[PDB]
Design an enzyme around this catalytic site. Structure first.
Site, PDB file in Angstrom:
ATOM      1  N   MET A   6       0.835  -1.200   0.000  1.00 26.10           N
ATOM      2  CA  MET A   6       0.000   0.000   0.000  1.00 26.10           C
ATOM      3  C   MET A   6       0.870   1.251   0.000  1.00 26.10           C
ATOM      4  SD  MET A   6      -2.889   1.299   2.638  1.00 26.10           S
ATOM      5  CE  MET A   6      -4.174   0.144   2.283  1.00 26.10           C
ATOM      6  N   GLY A  50       7.278   4.256   4.058  1.00 27.70           N
ATOM      7  CA  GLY A  50       8.033   5.467   4.355  1.00 27.70           C
ATOM      8  C   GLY A  50       9.082   5.161   5.387  1.00 27.70           C
ATOM      9  N   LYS A  51       9.442   6.186   6.148  1.00 27.63           N
ATOM     10  CA  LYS A  51      10.550   6.106   7.095  1.00 27.63           C
ATOM     11  C   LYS A  51      10.270   5.239   8.327  1.00 27.63           C
ATOM     12  CE  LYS A  51      12.519  10.585   5.790  1.00 27.63           C
ATOM     13  NZ  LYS A  51      12.576  11.994   6.239  1.00 27.63           N
ATOM     14  N   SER A  78       7.459   2.658   8.499  1.00 31.97           N
ATOM     15  CA  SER A  78       6.716   1.404   8.262  1.00 31.97           C
ATOM     16  C   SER A  78       6.567   1.126   6.785  1.00 31.97           C
ATOM     17  CB  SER A  78       5.301   1.441   8.885  1.00 31.97           C
ATOM     18  OG  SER A  78       4.429   2.254   8.082  1.00 31.97           O
ATOM     19  N   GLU A 103      -7.676  -4.331  10.561  1.00 38.04           N
ATOM     20  CA  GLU A 103      -8.722  -4.067   9.602  1.00 38.04           C
ATOM     21  C   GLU A 103      -8.285  -3.002   8.584  1.00 38.04           C
ATOM     22  OE1 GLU A 103     -12.017  -2.150  11.599  1.00 38.04           O
ATOM     23  OE2 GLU A 103     -13.362  -2.349   9.865  1.00 38.04           O
ATOM     24  N   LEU A 104      -8.610  -3.218   7.311  1.00 35.24           N
ATOM     25  CA  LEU A 104      -8.419  -2.189   6.278  1.00 35.24           C
ATOM     26  C   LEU A 104      -9.539  -1.176   6.437  1.00 35.24           C
ATOM     27  CD1 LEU A 104      -7.253  -1.025   3.490  1.00 35.24           C
ATOM     28  CD2 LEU A 104      -8.914  -2.492   2.363  1.00 35.24           C
ATOM     29  N   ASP A 163     -11.470   1.861   4.680  1.00 38.40           N
ATOM     30  CA  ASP A 163     -11.681   2.526   3.405  1.00 38.40           C
ATOM     31  C   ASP A 163     -11.884   4.021   3.639  1.00 38.40           C
ATOM     32  OD1 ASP A 163     -12.072   2.985   0.714  1.00 38.40           O
ATOM     33  OD2 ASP A 163     -14.116   2.165   0.663  1.00 38.40           O
ATOM     34  N   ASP A 215       1.121  10.766  18.478  1.00 33.98           N
ATOM     35  CA  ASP A 215       1.504  11.292  17.155  1.00 33.98           C
ATOM     36  C   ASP A 215       0.282  11.750  16.394  1.00 33.98           C
ATOM     37  OD1 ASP A 215       3.277  11.981  15.092  1.00 33.98           O
ATOM     38  OD2 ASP A 215       3.187   9.983  14.161  1.00 33.98           O
TER      39      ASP A 215
HETATM   40  N1  LIG Z   1      -5.740   0.087   8.917  1.00 40.16           N
HETATM   41  C1  LIG Z   1      -5.511   0.833   7.808  1.00 40.16           C
HETATM   42  N2  LIG Z   1      -6.446   1.039   6.833  1.00 40.16           N
HETATM   43  C2  LIG Z   1      -6.224   1.797   5.739  1.00 40.16           C
HETATM   44  N3  LIG Z   1      -5.058   2.431   5.510  1.00 40.16           N
HETATM   45  C3  LIG Z   1      -4.044   2.302   6.414  1.00 40.16           C
HETATM   46  C4  LIG Z   1      -4.215   1.489   7.625  1.00 40.16           C
HETATM   47  N4  LIG Z   1      -3.069   1.546   8.333  1.00 40.16           N
HETATM   48  C5  LIG Z   1      -2.217   2.312   7.612  1.00 40.16           C
HETATM   49  N5  LIG Z   1      -2.796   2.771   6.479  1.00 40.16           N
HETATM   50  C6  LIG Z   1      -2.169   3.648   5.456  1.00 40.16           C
HETATM   51  O1  LIG Z   1      -0.746   3.511   5.523  1.00 40.16           O
HETATM   52  C7  LIG Z   1      -0.157   4.766   5.919  1.00 40.16           C
HETATM   53  C8  LIG Z   1       0.959   4.516   6.912  1.00 40.16           C
HETATM   54  O2  LIG Z   1       0.389   3.952   8.100  1.00 40.16           O
HETATM   55  P1  LIG Z   1       0.704   4.548   9.540  1.00 40.16           P
HETATM   56  O3  LIG Z   1       0.054   3.623  10.534  1.00 40.16           O
HETATM   57  O4  LIG Z   1       0.292   5.994   9.578  1.00 40.16           O
HETATM   58  O5  LIG Z   1       2.295   4.348   9.659  1.00 40.16           O
HETATM   59  P2  LIG Z   1       3.485   5.472   9.563  1.00 40.16           P
HETATM   60  O6  LIG Z   1       3.986   5.600  10.968  1.00 40.16           O
HETATM   61  O7  LIG Z   1       4.459   4.806   8.661  1.00 40.16           O
HETATM   62  O8  LIG Z   1       2.908   6.774   9.060  1.00 40.16           O
HETATM   63  C9  LIG Z   1      -1.302   5.561   6.513  1.00 40.16           C
HETATM   64  O9  LIG Z   1      -1.130   6.995   6.475  1.00 40.16           O
HETATM   65  C10 LIG Z   1      -2.518   5.104   5.751  1.00 40.16           C
HETATM   66  O10 LIG Z   1      -2.640   5.850   4.527  1.00 40.16           O
END
Ligand SMILES: Nc1ncnc2c1ncn2[C@@H]1O[C@H](COP(=O)(O)OP(=O)(O)O)[C@@H](O)[C@H]1O
Ligand SMILES: [Mn+2]
Length: 267
Positions: free
Chosen positions: A97, A100-101, A103, A166-167, A169, A204
């Site tokens: 999906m 980045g830095k 995850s 969970e994803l 949307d 955060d």
């Molecule tokens: N449960 C989820 N459902 C849909 N999109 C997600 C979900 N978790 C992460 N994402 C997408 O992946 C991106 C990175 O996840 P995040 O948990 O914010 O980690 P990071 O610390 O790398 O920003 C999010 O900004 C979002 O767009």
């Protein structure tokens, strides 16, 4: 590619990876002799396996002081995915999906849980990659568990540096223009209050960690979370509130008093 990498791994490869994993608690680079003894694979064969895994970018081997091995991010992620597969929580990894830095987030499917994401985590003397990434994942998982039933993803599993959830949307708030920003901000601040009641501070909160759709808001990204009572929790909470209100002020010119908002939450 993660799926292709997974397919290159045999039983002996997984045993070698298990041996590194189980010895991360007291070595950054696990000595070859310990990897061999734990995996019950002879030293010469273990060395050959570790060389091939290094070729595949799954382990990093060093020899400066002694022959030792540790995971790369790719390798720790792969191993954590294996643990998820072996526990029946994940059937197939799917498409990346985004990365980045902090995850890499992948789509996946679970017969049990449906369409999910698995999030692989990347990251007292202020100047142990794997130990810290695993701690980050475990923290996010524990926060998500404590908050279940609120506006957060359902959480399904944690192994290694991986959290299965969970994803949602919905898109990041940063990417969405809302026509009722004052109500949206109030919904976020209400969720902050509900987290606090459950003894959790996000740590955060930002426009990048609130997801929005026509249907409502969700909050994500909990590896930095703290429990209420932990050192600095109050200042971390204040920061979350200040930062989200400041975002709305700059973007929408909402008028919300930061001090009163904090005081309302805290009382
Ligand atoms: N449960 C989820 N459902 C849909 N999109 C997600 C979900 N978790 C992460 N994402 C997408 O992946 C991106 C990175 O996840 P995040 O948990 O914010 O980690 P990071 O610390 O790398 O920003 C999010 O900004 C979002 O767009
Ligand atoms: Mn984020």
């Amino acid at each position: 590619n993660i799926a292709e990498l997974y397919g290159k791994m045999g039983k002996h490869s997984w045993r070698i990876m298990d041996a590194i994993f189980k010895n991360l608690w007291d070595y950054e680079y696990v000595p070859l002799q310990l990897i061999s003894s734990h995996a019950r694979i002879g030293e010469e064969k273990a060395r050959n396996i570790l060389k091939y895994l290094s070729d595949l970018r799954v382990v990093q081997n060093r020899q400066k002081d002694y022959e030792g091995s540790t995971f790369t991010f790719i390798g720790l992620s792969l191993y954590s995915l294996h643990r998820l597969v072996r526990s029946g929580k994940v059937d197939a990894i799917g498409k990346l999906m985004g990365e980045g830095k902090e995850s890499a987030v992948f789509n996946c499917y679970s017969e049990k849980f449906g369409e999910c994401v698995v999030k692989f985590h990347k990251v007292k003397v202020k100047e142990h990659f794997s130990v810290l990434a695993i701690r980050s994942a475990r923290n996010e998982f524990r926060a998500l568990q404590k908050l279940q039933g609120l506006a957060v993803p359902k959480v399904y599993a944690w192994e290694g540096n991986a959290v299965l959830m969970e994803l949602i949307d919905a898109k990041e708030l940063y990417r969405v223009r809302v026509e009722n920003p004052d109500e949206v901000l109030d919904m976020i601040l209400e969720e902050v209050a509900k987290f606090y009641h459950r003894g959790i501070v996000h740590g955060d909160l930002s426009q990048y960690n609130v997801l929005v759709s026509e249907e409502g808001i969700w909050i994500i990204d909990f590896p930095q979370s703290v429990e209420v009572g932990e050192e600095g929790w109050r200042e971390i909470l204040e920061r979350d509130v200040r930062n989200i209100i400041t975002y709305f002020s700059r973007t929408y010119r909402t008028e919300k008093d930061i001090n009163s908002a904090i005081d309302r939450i805290l009382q």
